[PDB]
Amino acid sequence: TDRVSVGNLRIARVLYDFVNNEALPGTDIDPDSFWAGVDKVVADLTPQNQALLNARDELQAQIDKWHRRRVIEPIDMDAYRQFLTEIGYLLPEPDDFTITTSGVDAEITTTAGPQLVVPVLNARFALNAANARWGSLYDALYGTDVIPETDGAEKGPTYNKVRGDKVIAYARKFLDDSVPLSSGSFGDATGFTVQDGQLVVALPDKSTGLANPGQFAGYTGAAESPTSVLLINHGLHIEILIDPESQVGTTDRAGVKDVILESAITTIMDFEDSVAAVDAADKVLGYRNWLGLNKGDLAAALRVLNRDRNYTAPGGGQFTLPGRSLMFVRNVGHLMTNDAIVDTDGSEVFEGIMDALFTGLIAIHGLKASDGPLINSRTGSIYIVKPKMHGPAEVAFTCELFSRVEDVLGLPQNTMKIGIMDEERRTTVNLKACIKAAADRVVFINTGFLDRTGDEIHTSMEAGPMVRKGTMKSQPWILAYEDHNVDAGLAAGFSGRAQVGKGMWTMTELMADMVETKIAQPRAGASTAWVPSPTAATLHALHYHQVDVAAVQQGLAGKRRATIEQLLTIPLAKELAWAPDEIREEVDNNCQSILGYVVRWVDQGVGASKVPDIHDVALMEDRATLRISSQLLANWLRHGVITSADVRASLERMAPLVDRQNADVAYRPMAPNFDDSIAFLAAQELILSGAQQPNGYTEPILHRRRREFKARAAE
Ligand SMILES: O=C(O)C(=O)CC(=O)c1ccccc1Br
Ligand SMILES: [Mg+2]
Ligand SMILES: [Mg+2]
Numbered sequence: 001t002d003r004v005s006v007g008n009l010r011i012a013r014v015l016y017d018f019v020n021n022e023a024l025p026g027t028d029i030d031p032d033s034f035w036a037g038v039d040k041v042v043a044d045l046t047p048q049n050q051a052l053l054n055a056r057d058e059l060q061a062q063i064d065k066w067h068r069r070r071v072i073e074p075i076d077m078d079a080y081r082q083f084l085t086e087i088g089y090l091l092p093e094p095d096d097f098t099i100t101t102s103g104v105d106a107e108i109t110t111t112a113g114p115q116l117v118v119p120v121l122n123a124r125f126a127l128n129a130a131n132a133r134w135g136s137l138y139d140a141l142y143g144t145d146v147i148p149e150t151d152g153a154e155k156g157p158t159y160n161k162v163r164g165d166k167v168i169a170y171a172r173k174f175l176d177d178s179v180p181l182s183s184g185s186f187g188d189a190t191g192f193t194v195q196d197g198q199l200v201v202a203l204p205d206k207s208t209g210l211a212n213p214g215q216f217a218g219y220t221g222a223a224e225s226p227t228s229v230l231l232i233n234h235g236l237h238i239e240i241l242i243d244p245e246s247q248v249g250t251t252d253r254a255g256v257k258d259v260i261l262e263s264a265i266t267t268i269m270d271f272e273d274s275v276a277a278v279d280a281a282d283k284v285l286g287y288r289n290w291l292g293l294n295k296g297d298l299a300a301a302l303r304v305l306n307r308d309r310n311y312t313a314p315g316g317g318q319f320t321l322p323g324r325s326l327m328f329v330r331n332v333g334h335l336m337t338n339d340a341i342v343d344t345d346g347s348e349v350f351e352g353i354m355d356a357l358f359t360g361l362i363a364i365h366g367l368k369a370s371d372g373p374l375i376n377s378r379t380g381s382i383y384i385v386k387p388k389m390h391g392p393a394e395v396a397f398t399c400e401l402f403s404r405v406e407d408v409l410g411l412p413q414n415t416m417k418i419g420i421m422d423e424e425r426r427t428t429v430n431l432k433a434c435i436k437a438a439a440d441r442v443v444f445i446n447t448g449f450l451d452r453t454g455d456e457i458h459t460s461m462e463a464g465p466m467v468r469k470g471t472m473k474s475q476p477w478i479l480a481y482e483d484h485n486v487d488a489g490l491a492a493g494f495s496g497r498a499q500v501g502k503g504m505w506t507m508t509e510l511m512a513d514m515v516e517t518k519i520a521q522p523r524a525g526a527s528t529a530w531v532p533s534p535t536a537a538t539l540h541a542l543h544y545h546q547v548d549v550a551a552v553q554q555g556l557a558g559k560r561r562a563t564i565e566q567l568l569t570i571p572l573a574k575e576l577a578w579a580p581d582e583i584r585e586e587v588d589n590n591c592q593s594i595l596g597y598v599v600r601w602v603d604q605g606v607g608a609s610k611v612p613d614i615h616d617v618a619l620m621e622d623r624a625t626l627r628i629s630s631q632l633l634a635n636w637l638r639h640g641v642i643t644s645a646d647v648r649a650s651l652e653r654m655a656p657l658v659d660r661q662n663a664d665v666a667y668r669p670m671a672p673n674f675d676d677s678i679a680f681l682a683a684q685e686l687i688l689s690g691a692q693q694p695n696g697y698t699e700p701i702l703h704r705r706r707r708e709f710k711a712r713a714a715e
């Protein structure tokens with residue numbers, strides 16, 4: 001074949017060469033020692049990895065049966081809880097404790113702000129994301145619907161001054177609200193100066209300073225007429241760019257050209273739900289981008305990584321600020337294998353194990369000088385998001401894997417830190433124990449509410465028909481889950497030490513709506529939450545200026561706002577809940593979103609796509625949102641809400657509509673020859689086989705179908 005033999009492993013040549021030629025050089029790790037380490041870790045840890053996956057299946061089978069043997073209508077919560085406890089699903093809560101994780105950067109322990117997630121296989125997106133630490137407020141406002149396109153203020157081929165003025169006014173109000181003047185408004189400012197190290201703002205009638213002179217962080221240019229003024233509020237920087245010569249500045253009362261916000265404080269470079277990588281070739285593409293990010297030389301077309309930013313302190317001396325988003329990497333979880341490496345028997349190696357080895361290896365570069373200062377962690381940490389874990393034993397396993405990898409890489413123990421996704425029910429209900437299992441590695445917890453919703457549906461699949469997808473966000477279980485997560489983090493001493501994060505805004509074009517509603521997340525004490533783009537990061541930063549998360553967290557301390565009973569409230573629908581038109585809409589909406597996402601996954605290897613839903617709302621789709629849709633339809637089919645003819649008819653009805661939306665270029669229509677389309681059959685399979693997928697996961701089918709598509713293409 002095209003494999004390299006090391007011990008009991010047979011490594012795809014493309015991966016072997018990448019590691020030897022590109023990843024290892026510069027780390028001072030001996031190539032032969034590295035590969036011996038891979039062999040040993042894989043051999044040592046594979047058995048427990050398999051045992052954990054088996055335990056999931058066993059627990060689900062018992063719960064399935066428990067529901068089928070229920071006669072009593074209103075589910076008996078006391079009995080249900082006792083059953084979960086008996087089978088080892090619900091474990092004892094440990095005594096209070098405080099996490100001890102150290103060597104963590106300020107962006108994580110202390111700074112509250114947006115966290116951006118981006119597919120690592122897309123180099124351009126990854127570059128923009130790394131560079132999203134700073135972003136233009138004017139661009140974000142002008143370019144989105146945050147400023148309405150009412151009569152007069154519509155966007156067009158050229159600059160609209162009426163809209164420009166609304167942008168200016170919006171930002172002036174932001175400044176008044178965030179960094180207030182002693183008296184007067186920024187709206188009436190005519191200039192800025194620095195005298196005796198103090199910010200002085202010219203008003204038409206008098207001059208004034210900040211209500212809080214401490215918010216003045218520095219400036220650029222001459223003190224007598226700065227080219228910019230740097231402010232700080234709630235730990236985040238705001239920069240007013242002063243330039244009367246510019247188009248916008250010419251029209252401005254104080255010659256202001258733009259207001260720049262510190263935006264995406266940290267970014268997660270994703271190997272998991274937002275990318276499609278099903279073999280060694282795909283994995284290498286991803287690994288190479290992560291390498292380029294950490295070595296600091298990733299470049300497109302040239303677009304490159306930003307350097308740090310230089311400022312003068314109020315007093316006159318010099319300082320710098322980070323120009324890049326501090327990077328995490330999201331590895332895949334414990335489920336999947338990948339044929340990038342197979343053993344002598346031809347068995348595929350667990351992908352999570354490989355990701356820890358290879359992403360960890362590559363991250364070493366980000367800890368050292370780049371052709372420039374080192375790119376990433378100045379405190380010496382590697383930041384890894386670990387998704388889709390179920391319960392404390394699975395967290396303990398991730399910790400043991402990272403420990404073994406550190407030994408192979410010659411890194412200090414606990415270098416590799418863990419961002420824990422709380423996105424599976426068996427983690428939610430055992431959250432305190434999960435944090436404790438990683439007490440010296442954890443750098444965040446985050447409510448991955450989309451995956452968590454998929455797991456909610458699958459876990460209780462046999463219980464009955466679930467409510468419509470759009471109803472889930474307001475169900476008792478999810479509201480308890482969100483508060484429970486914050487409570488556990490604060491109780492474990494996260495304030496000042498680790499992020500308490502919440503989930504993704506998927507409506508990429510609904511920025512007015514995002515600005516209105518996502519403020520709920522920091523108001524709930526989350527020190528970070530997920531955004532889908534650098535523009536959304538800049539707009540979400542507004543919320544952290546309005547809400548003092550540090551104060552909110554202090555206020556929430558010691559509260560227990562969710563009960564186990566509330567967490568365990570299954571979102572069953574009521575009898576006769578739906579008219580036919582409602583059922584039809586749910587079916588068509590789900591099939592449309594499934595087909596829209598899956599067609600690009602299977603035929604083009606794209607793991608995240610904007611897919612208009614049935615209401616024509618552009619939604620960023622990833623595997624988690626697919627997990628929900630496929631599981632919901634699987635559940636409705638299982639309980640007789642819909643028939644197999646209903647499903648097939650809906651798929652065939654929506655497919656041509658998806659074809660139309662993709663009609664460009666490497667796209668192959670699904671209709672009318674449905675049985676000839678691997679993409680269509682994948683979509684169908686996710687629904688018709690959904691109840692039989694482990695925990696409702698979409699990867700086994702997606703990976704199989706993508707590999708099938710590639711094989712046909714090659715023949
Ligand atoms: O909610 C969860 O399960 C996630 O983990 C979300 C997620 O990755 C995502 C969902 C939609 C669009 C982009 C992303 Br990065
Ligand atoms: Mg079964
Ligand atoms: Mg997730």
Ligand SMILES: [Mg+2]
Nearest residue numbers: 234545547548
């Ligand atoms: Mg405040």
